[PDB]
Amino acid sequence: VLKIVTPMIGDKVYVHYKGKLFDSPFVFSLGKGQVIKAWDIGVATMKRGEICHLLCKPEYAYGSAGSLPKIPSNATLFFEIELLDFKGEDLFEDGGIIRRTKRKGEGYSNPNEGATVEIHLEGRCGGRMFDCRDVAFTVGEGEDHDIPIGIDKALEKMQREEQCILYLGPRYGFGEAGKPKFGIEPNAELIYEVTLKSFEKAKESWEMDTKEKLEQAAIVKEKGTVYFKGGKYMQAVIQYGKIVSWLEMEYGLSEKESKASESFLLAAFLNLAMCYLKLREYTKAVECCDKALGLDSANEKGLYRRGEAQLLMNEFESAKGDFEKVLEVNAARLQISMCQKKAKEHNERDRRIYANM
């Protein structure tokens, strides 16, 4: 590959080109075999908005097979390439975590939630470095080691020996609380450089026998609750969710395990509903309450919770009932009057807008 007048592995690249010995915004990913070697090698050396020329040998193009009709068998291709722009890969199609690969890794697998990993971590805020260490920890629980949830999430998409830069938006960094020990203000954007050195996966649900699932459920219900008290709801949701995950579908259990299994679920479902309430994620609440109810149709906490949430979603009717059913069993009433009050207000508002629109 000879060149004549910077994107990173995995970046989204935008270019304009002409290729003569046959082809004339073309967007692909750099570093992946999506284009010929010459390009992956070439483009990797352009600064944005630049234009170059490349004499590519078959060895770096379509080799001896060529691409008939167009590209002959031993073709040495020439290229005029224009790098219009390029951006990092958005791990969760939401701009929350932008990754840019420094060094490909190796491996058939990736860390899962619950996996223990050993990484090198370098993190800064506004240019300032506040973290540079080797760390061993549990995916999903990095909070225990002063690591923001974004790193745990990114790790699930990395390989052994991979090194990348991760840009974490507010929703994946330390959040509203900020991180005092690091001099990190509320909802700050963070930048980390991470190298996954090794990792051992946690067992998938189907790989644990009933006995193990029940021992671990007790351990994580507790760990969830500790997090819950500390106001780390996100971490709690993760801990309680294992319980829903490890038991919700079990069967063929003995009466002794079946009761213990049920007991665990019902609680994991009521705790999540409370967790999601704190997280102002109402639909999740109602879902977790729904499950709770499907187990214990006359559950007090269940119905109340389904209520608080449905009210918060302007689902006044549905909410009215939940509290009523709460009364038909054992703050409900004050809330009951609340629904009606808020429902009235809601329709005045609905009528006002429609009229104004």
Q: Domain spans of the chain? A: 2-88, 89-202, 203-356
The identity of residue 202, as a single letter, is A
- Say what the alpha-carbon torsion angle 135, 139, 141, 143 is, to the nearest 10 degrees: 50
Q: Which of 79, 167, 228, 304 is catalytic?
A: 79
**79 is annotated as an active-site residue:** yes
**60 is annotated as an active-site residue:** no
**354 is annotated as an active-site residue:** no
The identity of residue 23, as a single letter, is D
Right CATH number for 203-356 from 3.40.50.300, 3.40.640.10, 1.25.40.10, 3.40.30.10? 1.25.40.10
Tokens of 48: 């944005």
Tokens of 181: 């020990």
The identity of residue 13, as a single letter, is V
Three-class secondary structure of residue 227 per DSSP: helix
Q: Which of 62, 192, 264, 269 is catalytic?
A: 62
316 CB-near residues (< 8 Å, 6+ apart): 310, 339, 340, 342, 343, 346
Q: How distant, in Å, are the alpha carbons of 9, 182, 229, 249, 308 from that of 194?
A: 15, 18, 30, 36, 41
Same fold, 2-88 and 203-356: no
Q: Which of 14, 17, 130, 182 is catalytic?
A: 17
Q: Rounded to whole angstroms, how far apart are CA atoms 236 and 243?
A: 11
- Beta strand 163-168 with 97-103 is antiparallel
Q: Which of 9, 11, 36, 81 is catalytic?
A: 36
Q: Is the Cβ–Cβ distance between 167 and 98 less than 8 Å?
A: yes
Task: Tell me how many degrees the CA angle 138-142-143 measures, rounded to the nearest 5.
Answer: 140
Environment class of 175 (CB within 10 Å of its CB; exposed 0-12, middle 13-18, buried 19+):
middle
For domain 89-202, give the fold: Chitinase A; domain 3 (3.10.50)
Tokens of 123: 């993190």
Helices (H), 31-138: 37-43
**17 is annotated as an active-site residue:** yes
Pick from 211, 83, 93, 71: which is nearest to 157 by CA? 93
Q: Rounded to whole angstroms, how far apart are CA atoms 4 and 128?
A: 37
ω into 148 cis (within 30 of 0) = no
Environment class of 128 (CB within 10 Å of its CB; exposed 0-12, middle 13-18, buried 19+):
exposed
For domain 2-88, give the fold: Chitinase A; domain 3 (3.10.50)
The string over 243-269, giving b where at least 16 C-beta atoms fall within 10 Å of a residue's C-beta and e elsewhere, is bbebbeebeebeeebeebbeebbbbbb
Task: Tell me how many degrees the CA angle 208-214-219 measures, rounded to the nearest 5.
Answer: 105
The identity of residue 151, as a single letter, is I
Environment class of 147 (CB within 10 Å of its CB; exposed 0-12, middle 13-18, buried 19+):
buried
Q: Which of 23, 144, 290, 350 is catalytic?
A: 23
Phi (first) and psi of residue 138, to 5 degrees: -100, 125
**62 is annotated as an active-site residue:** yes
- Residue 326's H or E segment, with its range, is helix 316-327
Q: Is the Cβ–Cβ distance between 151 and 142 less than 8 Å?
A: yes
Q: Rounded to whole angstroms, how far apart are CA atoms 75 and 56?
A: 9
**26 is annotated as an active-site residue:** no
Q: Is the Cβ–Cβ distance between 187 and 214 less than 8 Å?
A: no
Resolution (Å) of this entry: 2.7
